[PDB]
Paper text:
Here, we present the crystal structure of C. acetobutylicum thiolase (CaTHL), a type II biosynthetic thiolase that catalyses the first step of n-butanol biosynthesis and condenses two acetyl-CoAs to acetoacetyl-CoA. We reveal that CaTHL, unlike other type II biosynthetic thiolases from aerobic bacteria, is regulated via modulation of a redox-switch, indicating that n-butanol production and the relevant metabolic fluxes in Clostridium are tightly regulated by thiolase. CaTHL consists of three domains: an N-terminal α/β domain (N-domain, residues 1–119 and 249–269), a loop domain (L-domain, residues 120–248), and a C-terminal α/β domain (C-domain, residues 270–392). The N- and C-domains form a typical five-layered fold (α–β–α–β–α) observed in other thiolase superfamily of proteins including peroxisomal degradative thiolase from Saccharomyces cerevisiae, β-ketoacyl synthase II from E. coli, and the biosynthetic thiolase from Zoogloea ramigera (ZrTHL)14151617181920.
To further investigate the role of the redox state on the structural properties of CaTHL, the crystal structure of the reduced form of CaTHL was also determined using the C378S mutant CaTHL, a protein that cannot form a disulfide bond. The active state configuration of the reduced form of CaTHL was similar to that of ZrTHL, in which the two cysteine residues involved in the disulfide bond formation in the oxidized form positioned apart with a distance of ∼6.4 Å. The catalytic cysteine loop in the reduced form of CaTHL moved back to the active site by ∼8 Å. Accordingly, the flexible region was found to be highly ordered, forming the native sheet–turn–helix conformation as observed in ZrTHL. In the reduced form of CaTHL, the positions of two catalytic cysteine residues and the conformation of the catalytic cysteine loop were restored, resulting in an active form of the enzyme.
Numbering used by the authors:
A (entry chain B), B (entry chain A): 1 to 393
Amino acid sequence: MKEVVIASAVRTAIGSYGKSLKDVPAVDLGATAIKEAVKKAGIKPEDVNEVILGNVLQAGLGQNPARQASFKAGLPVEIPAMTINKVCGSGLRTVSLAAQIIKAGDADVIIAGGMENMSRAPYLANNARWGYRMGNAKFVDEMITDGLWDAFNDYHMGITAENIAERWNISREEQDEFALASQKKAEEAIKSGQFKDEIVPVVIKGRKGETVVDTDEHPRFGSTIEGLAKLKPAFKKDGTVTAGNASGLNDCAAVLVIMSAEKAKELGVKPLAKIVSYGSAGVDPAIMGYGPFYATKAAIEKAGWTVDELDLIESNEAFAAQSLAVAKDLKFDMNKVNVNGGAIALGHPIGASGARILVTLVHAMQKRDAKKGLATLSIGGGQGTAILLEKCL
Amino acid sequence: MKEVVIASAVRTAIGSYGKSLKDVPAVDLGATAIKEAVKKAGIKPEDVNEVILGNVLQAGLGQNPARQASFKAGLPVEIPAMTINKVCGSGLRTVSLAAQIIKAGDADVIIAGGMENMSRAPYLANNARWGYRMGNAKFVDEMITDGLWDAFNDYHMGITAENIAERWNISREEQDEFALASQKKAEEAIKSGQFKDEIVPVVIKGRKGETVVDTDEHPRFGSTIEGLAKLKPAFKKDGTVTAGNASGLNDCAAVLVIMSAEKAKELGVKPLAKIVSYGSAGVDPAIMGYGPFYATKAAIEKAGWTVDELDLIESNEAFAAQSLAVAKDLKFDMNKVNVNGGAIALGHPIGASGARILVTLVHAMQKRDAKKGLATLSIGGGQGTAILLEKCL
């Protein structure tokens, strides 16, 4: 059926929790990204058929956050929009959903991606409507409940990472080493300009004037192995997962224009990459960090490739323990993986994260002249999503 | 392109706000409906390839509510699931998304539909995370914010209904006469058993015994025109929209098994209807209730049909004002519209509503032997979505 291409790929900088982007709602991050993605694609906003955006922490954001980003971007009100929640997978799944809708014959141009502002998540009173009646209750952190807590096992995602570390014997030192390598690669990438083509600046209009945020602030420049080794376990006693070898709580939007190859040609667009195949898979929730293994194999099976064939891989770093397990099992050449750093350094804005690694992948492919790329990531609740790209000449 | 069929269509009863389903989470409503939809389709849980469910009031429901419903229904962990938010359209749009994925070649059997428990929606504190510092603040009703408030114009959905009453010159009396006829049709339908096939019971098992809910709670039997005429306006001074000519706040889940025709044949399934075509469209948010006009026209054009060819129509009754505007402009034969009553009587459980009308439409097409059917509904934020069905021989 129809061939599907990426026309443009843009993201905001990734803000740290409570920091640079704390005053910028997710839908405004999304709007910023959508407007620049349409500009970079060289198409008219009236060319767009649908908007499909990932967002996990929807609480109190108002009706249909994807529609709000679309409106705030200046897209025509006649364009339909919907918000997707697949937890960590959400922003990458909207890209394969776009490809599906285009393959189905129903659209030619779709805005896809994700947006999250974890800094802005509310607290909840679940029984305020009809009453608590008597006794103390929980004032619930919505970011943890909706984003970070396994709904079946009643523990944090971090415990799923410990579960993998324990089953696979991925040691603290192996996790810390992996974290250090991610940090060094992010520092090198930031300072050498690797992210300039993909980052749209966010212009913040405060009281005392305008501020511009255009750089990823989560990396820890000058990280050392001894500094990593001093940290304490974050999730259990004598555990292996720490704040230094797990990603953060972060804010970002990442948006792509997805088109049929035929429409792209008709509109004079020069695509960045072809979407060759994709997949999604479920796993036991207790080992969610493993979901990429099954999503990636299904997708590769469709592509007719092998892992050795891949020139660049983005495999998300929610936790070193999970990235290492997926890497061992799929036998990745680690030199081709997260070549500009990964989420331990860069951050993990949940609803945007999978879109964010895809933006990073397609730019890196364009700059290094790589042919075959893979983007894949784990999903809270025990899933995975993967997309395979082939560069356009 | 693969043909796509509805294998089964099941819903819970529609509960009134704070009443019969107040103690049943949306995901448990969803799991009840999934389990019965799978049974009715005559398939096995392992035949399901993906779960895609609408849910609007996601706040504090935990990671990926669709995934939770799937797991609770006894579907395998390996199955991917995602939660869709298109406000009122959510539960209908997952069905057309299911069709699109099957058409794209990526699945044969998908659980679709929606779930909502408005009674259970939390209250929010938006600045509890970093602090209020000083001064009173808003304790935010999440049901209103995320479900019922226009994000662009900063007023209730009820004001958009008033806007349509004014611009289409639809009187208070016209709205009331419409409401009364819905109430009468619902009463007659309920008492003659029209919904008995489609409704799956919900068993509420507390500490001390069990209660069965299997009937729609919201209808006001013995409604009168004088009873309606006396009501106060709900949304503005001297308004035309009231509690009597607007739908309610309600709890429900509605689920369909969606399959390719070839898979249904292989598995021995006797499908209820073919999905012929579908459409989504945007409109000014200020008149969101007109959304179905454009969505319906798109879907009819794509099907190669006409409005006059339709045998049964489900056009959602979010407000009489909007239902009447849509019916006038599409020139519906009103004896074919909402023949078992509509949402003014039955309720509007936002995330499920779209799926609920489709369930009602397919059962009514079976019972009345009607060949061509339309389901369509308005969407807060200025959208509409529609699906066209053709009965299976």
